[PDB]
Amino acid sequence: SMKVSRDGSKVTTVVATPGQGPDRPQEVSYTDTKVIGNGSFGVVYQAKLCDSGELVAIKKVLQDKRFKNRELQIMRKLDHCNIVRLRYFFYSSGEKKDEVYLNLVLDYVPETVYRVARHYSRAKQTLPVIYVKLYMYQLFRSLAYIHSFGICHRDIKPQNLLLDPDTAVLKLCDFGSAKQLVRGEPNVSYICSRYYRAPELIFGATDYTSSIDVWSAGCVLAELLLGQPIFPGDSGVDQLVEIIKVLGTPTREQIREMNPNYTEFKFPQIKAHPWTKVFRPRTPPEAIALCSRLLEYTPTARLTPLEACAHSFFDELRDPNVKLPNGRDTPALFNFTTQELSSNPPLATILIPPHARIQ
Amino acid sequence: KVTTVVATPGQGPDRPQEVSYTDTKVIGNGSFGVVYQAKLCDSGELVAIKKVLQDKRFKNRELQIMRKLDHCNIVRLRYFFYSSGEKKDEVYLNLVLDYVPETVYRVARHYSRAKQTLPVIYVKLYMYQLFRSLAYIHSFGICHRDIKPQNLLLDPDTAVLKLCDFGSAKQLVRGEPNVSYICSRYYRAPELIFGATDYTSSIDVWSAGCVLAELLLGQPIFPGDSGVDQLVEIIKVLGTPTREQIREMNPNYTEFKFPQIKAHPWTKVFRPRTPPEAIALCSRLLEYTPTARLTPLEACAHSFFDELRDPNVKLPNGRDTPALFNFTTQELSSNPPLATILIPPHA
Ligand SMILES: Cc1cnc(Nc2ccccc2)nc1-c1c[nH]c(C(=O)N[C@H](CO)c2ccccc2)c1
Ligand SMILES: Cc1cnc(Nc2ccccc2)nc1-c1c[nH]c(C(=O)N[C@H](CO)c2ccccc2)c1
């Protein structure tokens, strides 16, 4: 249950469970709620914590009475600077009478990559490369982190990437499609959003890996560089054609690696187009090389997130003299944990620059 | 200015002839090609030229399908010819089709933008003609696979509708598997979303029901930027699919983890004034079980279209309705007795 009180301002008081740590119920009071988003079976609100005046987001979704909520279970295990934090969670009633709702109290972040990319795009401009590096690097860290638990996000897209304009901090949100992928277990091929979907998903594979998230992250990188989506299309076929026009027709081996539910091998035989000509003239060559290593047909051939973080496109971020354009310091970038580095510990060699190993 | 080609007639004999056209301009594009408008020098008649890259390994399937089609609600293939194009040294197939001035997409959008709904008379005329074109193609075992407002051409003055874009079309044979990645966002049958490769022509009927619902609503009935979001929008109307319904749809794989939602009464999906027959028709098109959906010919015989069979019906423009009852044996083959309803006594 929750209690409402009232300058006449409406206040909601709930007893909530901490997102992380021991189950020690807390009384949480908030006010000034407003809708900031919607999604399947729910709504996202912004609210202000009564005592601190701190803004939070409350994601309220319909609760299935047969099982515990998978998004909640996944979020209870996460603790990373580039993932939106689950502060508390509580149950309540909602619109549909007699139904139970799960409420996730998360950090509130002011912007999304989607809105930012769109402001620039509409003005016929592009996000300065420094921000592309900062944002993409942080996305790859959040992915190395989740993948280290075997968790695949499954729906990486600009709308699910939150950002703090002033600190240049990026946070991954929306774990509603996230799932642990276990080798030999099949998974649904209908996840992931239009323009971001890995070709093996388009082809109907159920044996895909976490590398689907890397393909998605490459699509976001390419889009931030181009000012528009690299592989648009309103159908799977049209998407594959846009892909084929860049990468060239996949080989029969590449199809086998992607492992479609079914295919006819009836796409025309198109030769790859040089990645360099995909982008505008002065695009940094390292940005281009990075995309070419993310956006590959063979899922196993794609860089892993931790390898992406170690890519040379991000070398500028490891420069001891780097600052945000606004003179501020960059957010924390090298405080890697053992968990975070577990896929390939020796990469710490590149990842943690000499100046960050200073005593 | 003037382009002269030796082109092969779309139908009949393979006897090419010289064809001259002028005034070309881009009207659209798509996977591996562009659509031009042009004017035939001899008749002054406007045509559309769909030019696509040509794979030499095979015959062009869109061309082969179009060469066999002859229906008043299908865009006509006048000629076809080969030429060069943008990509140096590549060959291009050029389809010379009838030009039609509008699309259901643009018209529906004009209405939407102006906060108005398309008069029901047009919804009936357009949908009925779409179902005739589908009854026709399905009678040859051909499934269009990409029914959507942008592929539905319209002549504003005659209220004639023509199906176009046969680039995904294919003959579907029982026991042969087919790709699940065809069909466009918002129109896709749930079995396609679920990754079935054993789907039938009824995927076109689901798509047609989505168009009908959209013309009634003023916006798409099942939006979403991912398959999962689309299925949620579907589930919010039809209710959670039953284990048996899943089996009929036959997904490549599914978890059975969607919440258990009860159906929403179709009547409350639409505005209050919506004709009950329009609603009943949707309910019979938009069904989880693919075999349960009306066939196109049964859809044409539905009572929502009774007004079109009225001997006194007229277009709002004062003109007569276009041809609606010139059914063939081929066209009626799925269920001949329906001719009884379909061909009104006055026709
Ligand atoms: C958690 C969170 C924090 N801050 C913001 N900020 C923001 C949003 C819009 C504009 C500017 C700032 N957003 C979120 C948030 C955004 N999306 C989601 C989310 O989980 N969305 C999914 C849809 O992707 C969803 C929402 C409701 C129901 C089901 C899924 C959380
Ligand atoms: C055949 C045709 C005739 N007339 C018109 N008129 C029209 C077009 C746009 C606005 C208003 C009127 N359009 C067409 C036509 C429309 N789409 C297609 C078509 O086949 N398009 C597909 C994409 O759906 C396509 C085009 C080029 C390459 C590959 C596919 C033909």
How many angstroms separate the CA atoms of A52 and A73, rounded?
27
The answer to whether B72 and B326 are in contact (CB under 8 A) is yes
Instruction: For chain A, give percent helix, strand, coil, nearest 5.
Output: 35, 20, 45
The number of residues in chain A equals 359
Same domain, A79 and A175: no
Same domain, B31 and B133: no
Write the Ramachandran bin of B337: left for phi over 0, alpha for psi from -120 to 50, otherwise beta: alpha
Residue A225: strand, helix, or coil? helix
CA distances from A17 to A14, A68, A89, A92 (A): 10, 15, 5, 13
In a domain, A67, yes or no: yes
When computed from its CA atoms, the radius of gyration of chain B, rounded to whole angstroms, is 21
Reported for B266-274, long-range contacts at CB under 8 A and 24+ positions apart, including other chains, are B266/B237, B269/B213, B269/B217, B269/B221, B269/B237, B270/B216, B270/B217, B271/B117, B271/B216, B271/B217, B274/B216
Same domain, B226 and B175: yes
Same domain, A342 and A248: yes
In a domain, B108, yes or no: yes
Find the angle CA(A168)-CA(A169)-CA(A173) to the nearest 5 degrees.
135
How many angstroms separate the CA atoms of B144 and A266, rounded?
17
In a domain, A132, yes or no: yes
Query: Which residues, at least 6 apart from B330, have a Cβ–Cβ distance to it below 8 Å?
Result: B136, B139, B140
How many angstroms separate the CA of residue B182 from the nearest CA in chain A? 6
How many angstroms separate the CA atoms of B19 and B5, rounded?
5
Q: What is the DSSP letter of B61?
A: H
Domain count, chain A: 2
End-to-end CA, chain B: 46
Q: For B97, phi and psi rounded to 5 degrees?
A: -115, 170
With a 6 A CB cut-off, is A285 part of the ligand 1 pocket?
no
**Subunit contact A194:B226, Cβ cutoff 8 A:** yes
Query: Residues preceding discontinuities in chain A at C–N > 2.5 Å?
Result: 6
With a 6 A CB cut-off, is A156 part of the ligand 1 pocket?
no
- Beta pairing partners, B50: B35, B95
CATH for A91: 3.30.200.20
**Solved with:** X-ray
Residue B22: strand, helix, or coil? strand
Q: Among residues A157, A150, A141, which one has the least CA distance to residue A195?
A: A157
Q: For residue B225, which residues of chain A lie inside 8 Å, CB to CB? A: 157, 193-194
Residue B147: CB atoms within 10 A of its CB come to 28
- Beta pairing partners, B40: B21
Q: Among residues A135, A126, A208, which one has the least CA distance to residue A172?
A: A135
Element (H, E) at A45: strand A42-49
Reported resolution, Å: 2.3
Place of tokens 């931030």: A224
Antiparallel, parallel or unpaired: β B142-143 and B92-98: unpaired
- Beta pairing partners, B37: B25, B48
How many angstroms separate the CA atoms of B342 and B82, rounded?
41
Residue-number span of the structural domain to which B259 is assigned? 102-347
Query: Which residues, at least 6 apart from B72, have a Cβ–Cβ distance to it below 8 Å?
Result: B132, B160, B322, B323, B326
In a domain, A17, yes or no: no
When computed from its CA atoms, the radius of gyration of chain A, rounded to whole angstroms, is 21
Find the angle CA(A113)-CA(A117)-CA(A120) to the nearest 5 degrees.
145
CA distances from B114 to A44, B108, B120, B223 (A): 30, 10, 16, 21
The residue out of A72, A94, A110 marking a domain boundary is A110
Residue burial A217-243, b: 16+ Cβ < 10 Å; e: rest: bbbbbbbbbbbebbbebbbbbbbbbbb
**Subunit contact B195:A186, Cβ cutoff 8 A:** no
* Nearest ligand 1 atom, CA A104: 1
Report the pocket of ligand 2 as residue ranges, CB < 6 Å: B 27-35, 48, 50, 52, 75, 97, 99-103, 151, 153, 164-165, 167
The answer to whether B47 and B135 are in contact (CB under 8 A) is no
Tokens of A33: 């709620």
How many angstroms separate the CA of residue A214 from the nearest CA in chain B? 18
Same domain, A67 and A136: no
Query: Which residues, at least 6 apart from A26, have a Cβ–Cβ distance to it below 8 Å?
Result: A15, A16, A17, A18, A88
Place of tokens 């399908």: B65
Same domain, B109 and B235: yes
Catalytic site includes residue A155: yes
Residue burial B283-309, b: 16+ Cβ < 10 Å; e: rest: bbbbbbebeebbbbbbbbbbebbebbb
